[PDB]
Amino acid sequence: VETFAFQAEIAQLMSLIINTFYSNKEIFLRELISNSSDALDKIRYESLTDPSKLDSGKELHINLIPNKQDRTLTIVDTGIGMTKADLINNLGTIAKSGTKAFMEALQAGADISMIGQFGVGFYSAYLVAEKVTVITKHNDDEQYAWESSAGGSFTVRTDTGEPMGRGTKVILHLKEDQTEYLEERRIKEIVKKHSQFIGYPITLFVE
């Protein structure tokens, strides 16, 4: 279990997301599905010059798994996955320039629903989650669990859970006031309104 500090900018974005009054929380779901869609484009893309990159699983899709018992909503994709270096270095680099641009727009008229246009939509998960655990597997690397409850830090460990093949699970530990996002009907309403044209199948699991 290693512990790392976020860069100043990302930490500050994360507190803004957590502390600002903003009632339209539901946009988190569009952002994570859109992240999954991008990760699926990326695996489909690299496999064009190396078809063996699909040995770890051919199917390209997304599952939404609510669990009232654990109070979690998990978004699962078989996209390209993230390496250790992504989790500790590259994602932070991407998040730095994206945060700055998002900040500039926010003070000049924009709102939190436009976060995905700046490449930092993942952090919108913190509108509804007190803790996010991300389990990720990339092709020539091991399986990792990343985890953060914000407050300026995150952890990374080699994951010993069930091996997952290739891709990412984002596990959202929902705040107590946000269990609406565990309801089939709420989720289905949200997918229909904001995520109806994704180029990969999306399956909504029932409890």
Ligand SMILES: Nc1nc2c3ccc(NCCO)cc3nc(Cc3ccc4c(c3)OCO4)n2n1
């Ligand atoms: N499902 C999925 N797949 C990817 C993903 C897959 C590949 C990738 N490549 C990074 C450049 O090598 C970046 C990615 N970024 C995100 C967004 C993301 C951004 C920040 C994150 C995070 C995920 O988990 C922990 O912190 N996702 N989300």
